[PDB]
Amino acid sequence: HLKPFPPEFLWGAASAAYQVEGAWNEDGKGLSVWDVFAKQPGRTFKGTNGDVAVDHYHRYQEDVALMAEMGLKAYRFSVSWSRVFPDGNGAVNEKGLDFYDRLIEELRNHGIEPIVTLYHWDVPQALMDAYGAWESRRIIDDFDRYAVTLFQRFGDRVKYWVTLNEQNIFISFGYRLGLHPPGVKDMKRMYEANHIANLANAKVIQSFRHYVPDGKIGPSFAYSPMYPYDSRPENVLAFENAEEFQNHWWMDVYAWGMYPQAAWNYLESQGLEPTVAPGDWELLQAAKPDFMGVNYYQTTTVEHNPPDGVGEGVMNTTGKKGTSTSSGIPGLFKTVRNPHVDTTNWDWAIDPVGLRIGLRRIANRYQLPILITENGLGEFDTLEPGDIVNDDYRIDYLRRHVQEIQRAITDGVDVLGYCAWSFTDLLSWLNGYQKRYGFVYVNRDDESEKDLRRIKKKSFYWYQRVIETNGAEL
Template identity: 60%
Template sequence: MYFEKSKGFPKDFLWGSASAAYQVEGGWDADGKGVSNWDKFVRIPGKTFKATTGDKAVDHYHRYKEDVKLMAEMGLKTYRFSIAWTRIYPNGNGEVNEAGLQFYDDLINELLKYGIEPMVTVYHWDMPQALEEQYHGWENRQIVDDYVNYAKTLFERYGDRVHYWITMNEQNIFTSFGWLKGMHPPGKENDEKMFYQVNHHANMAHAKTVLALKEMYPDAKVGASFAYSPCYGYDRKPENAMAKADYDDLQNYWWMDIYAYGRYPRSAWAYLESRGVAPQMEEGDAKILKKAAALVDFMGVNYYQTCVAEYNDINGVGMTNTMNTTGEKGTAQVQGVPGLYKNPANDFLPTTDWDWTIDPMGIRMCCRDITSRYDLPVVISENGLGAFDKVEDGKIHDPYRIAYLKAHIEELKKACDDGCRVLAYCTWSYTDLLSWLNGYQKRYGFVYVDREEDENSGTLNRIPKDSYYWYKKVIETNGEEL
């Protein structure tokens, strides 16, 4: 759609930035914190780039005041961060750890002191290892109760001050990397049956958490953050258009329909049933999912890239566990599901050094699709560019990041003109941080952190990059000056 004049962003638009506990905090065993599945996984040789861990990360646990002060100077309206389950319940259930609760109390209060709205992610992938040992974590339905118990503890403690809650971060990623690709804990490969079962457990945990929150704080705003890659059909060949429909049902709507409608897409379900991998649902589940969906306030979207779907022969490519984690451009491989689709590169679009497609218009596509399919407001909970940054004379010039963010914000503005209700835009990330599989060299932040892959390297000093000052202006002008 074309509009002669843009209405711009809403007045109360939340300009934000995001992080996740494991990627920034460090202090992996500080003050009674328990061991998480990631604390364990990163110690398995070959799992992460140059064996990097989040043991120290960027030490946000000890430097949060300095980080929040920089946010305040920038004028940030909201800061999205996650809570480490293992700081609250070191064993996943049982005894609560007061020191852990206190840390997030302090962080929230520090944000509020400067008028920054905390946006809290309940779960950003770091599950207590004790639950893995007790009953295999997400594989066992028991986790639903433990998850809800943990979430309720957060609502009780912080619900008076936190108005925006995100239940799950990228359920589609942690489950596919954990049970299909073997690249996240628990490191299983091609276990399709369990993959769908685990997802059902996560869906129930999400739904029951939404219900619990709304009972305690009916006015709180809640949603899940989905890693949404809108998909283009390869060309006008009908088989390729059908490949796109298959991709959407199995890779996008499979999750978003649950969050927004409380049901699985029919054709995806039929396909999984025919192959004997549909999840087992218990009596009453469908009702709970529907009830929660009716109470969800927004769709959280982590947007990085679009993809292409092309028909994939039954003998065609499958899913591989290879990925460009080194930043050597051009090393990514085409992946697919035999008989359905494969995802070739889009030669109309440039890519990052890690072979992620750069497609600003995709962010508008996300908003448009969510608006017409679900009629829900959108929170962009992540969007950003992972790049190599260099310090020159104590400064970091990152025009590539500014160009990336500018182009995406321009498209987001168009989405607002299109009538999409966009509530917030959080860049990934605020400070540089650990990129799970790609180490510290893949940097996303507005604030540079002096550290390399080696745990003992760097001063951990913070230096605002050029993009920091640029975003400050964007916030000041409510997105008018880009």
């Protein structure tokens, strides 16, 4: 006997501004770091970039009408900081705020709850030029000025807010792997920037309690729960290391305002622990979120990694299955294929039980409500004549994950909502357009924008039925 989904459960779908909007230089928008980075040769697949994307900026009315036809309860999107502050911290661009105002008005006139993400990786280039963006404490008050601008303009109409989207990804990809802007490969700088971003998160949650006292706010963590390979004691110790180093390192700061000690000590032994200023711990501890945002796609299984062992691994960027290789931290852990689950063509594990495990771990450790801000299947889709897209593979992935959400609710996890990634097809940051996540197919590829026409996939009508039945019929 499963509990039903609660009556106001937020059945949602999501996007991110750079991936969807286009209009990269219109109506006074400034350069973001992704505008510049994606135009550097070799940074993105086939040189794809966000100049046009799927042109949601001009076509948002059509898109919102499709959300209404689906019956979406909530739509999660991000605000492009460079539309609001073209130089990051000077005068406000009213035309930029006016777009999100038009968008929010369209959502509310169709009965859709907006979920506003403050930051989805697109800090204005001018802040990078001025002081190195997230690597400088100057960004704390600059991010706060931007957040409060949005809180005052939209707080009357937006109850749910997300601060930093996947801080662990944009910080580690931007400063450890050099795959995202600023393209840096330096663990010391990575953890310095990470600490500053923690302070920025805490500062804007504090501001939120003043400006939107009736709202709900949280960060959105990119959560891959760790498994040990087996019961070998060295592999369980690897799992202890991996879950602390990869997940607690962020979620403990979010929930408790404290870094975990074993990870901190290991970083200290390497001269990598961040610089802490007077007042830092007090700010971080006093910034309790209303929920933990969870972006979930897969679990990760780990095993013992000797001190001379695996470091950076090969990432599957192409869609050719079986090409990923182990990555880890020498002396602590390394990843290994989970032999008890299947994987997508990009070698991502398909593990819906893992979502129940992840939701259970967050409840058990932090006692926080969870808003699932991203979950989805990225796959090639074929457009069949008749504008038909039979994505049963996507339906099956979403179905099994939503099922495990309900088992987690029945366990007692307070889950506020579920945002499928993504509503329409959109630009992937590094992999172009072919790896599609949408309920709504967008007619374009890596070579041509074609006509960008929207085509409802089979999963569109499946999710429409899920929402109509509040998830009783999956």
